[PDB]
Design a protein around this ligand. Structure first.
Ligand SMILES: O=P(O)(O)OC[C@H](O)CO
Ligand SMILES: [Ca+2]
Ligand code: NA
Length: 259
């Protein structure tokens, strides 16, 4: 049902990150309240091997810390402020309750929502953080998450998704595509994506009616990122995408009602 081509999915990009600091429990809670179908997680691995949720490989942008995630322990990362950066970046959206928000672990996110959320979880190329895929899988099993569609695994790395498809054939994967990858996409490339992935997630800027219909022609779900503008939401849905990654899940929830 969640994986039905005829279902339009709201994927809350790093949670309700248009309103709340990205990849915090509060961002995910807000996305839930806004009726997002999926909350979206990016994984990094700490020095002591723990999976945390963070978009960048470095702490710099979204915390009061500095340096690579993999050079720091979980304990030190849990001391950081992962909310104040948002108040500084977006003064007009700032809220006092964002000061002191924490970096969550994957464990903390699964524990917080259990089966009450659907998870859209990004892995890296296998060489980046050895053991990440296996640890992710074991965490999903711990929380009894492995309803097909309860969890989708996404990556820019084909190798990662191929590996995941090997280990857990019934675990839906989505191939992420950069703009220039999508720009030069072929039918040959799409048909093999279908062999391990249930969908494609391209930079929406690279989409047009033609390659949208082409992607859909291979029975692939289609979730472009990152779609924040109402005018773009409408255009992409009329073209035939089956969902979006958005920072504004309430807005997309409203728009998609007409499609
Ligand atoms: O957020 P970006 O810019 O890394 O684009 C990928 C989206 O998160 C979809 O995974
Ligand atoms: Ca992502
Ligand atoms: Na900072």
């Amino acid at each position: 049902n969640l994986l039905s081509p005829d279902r339009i999915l709201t994927v809350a990009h790093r949670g309700a990150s248009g309103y709340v600091p990205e990849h915090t429990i509060l961002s995910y809670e807000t996305a839930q309240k806004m009726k997002a179908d999926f909350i979206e997680l990016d994984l990094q691995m700490t020095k002591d091997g723990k999976l945390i949720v963070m978009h960048d490989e470095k702490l710099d942008r979204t915390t009061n810390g500095m340096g690579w995630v993999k050079d720091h322990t979980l304990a030190d990362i849990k001391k950081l402020d992962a909310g104040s950066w948002f108040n500084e970046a977006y003064p007009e959206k700032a809220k006092p309750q964002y000061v002191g928000l924490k970096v969550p672990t994957l464990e903390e996110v699964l524990d917080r929502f259990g089966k009450h959320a659907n998870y859209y979880i990004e892995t890296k190329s296998p060489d980046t953080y050895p053991g990440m895929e296996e640890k992710l899988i074991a965490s999903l099993q711990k929380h009894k998450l492995l309803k097909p569609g309860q969890v989708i695994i996404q990556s820019f790395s084909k190798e990662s998704l191929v590996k995941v498809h090997q280990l857990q054939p019934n675990l839906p994967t989505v191939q992420l595509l950069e703009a220039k990858q999508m720009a030069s996409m072929t039918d040959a490339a799409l048909e093999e994506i279908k062999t391990y992935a249930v969908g494609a997630g391209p930079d929406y800027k690279a989409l047009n009616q033609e390659n949208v219909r082409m992607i859909r022609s291979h029975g692939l779900l289609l979730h472009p990122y990152t779609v924040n503008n109402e005018a773009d939401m409408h255009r992409l849905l009329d073209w035939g995408v089956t969902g979006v990654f958005t920072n504004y899940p309430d807005l997309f929830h409203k728009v998609k009602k007409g499609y």
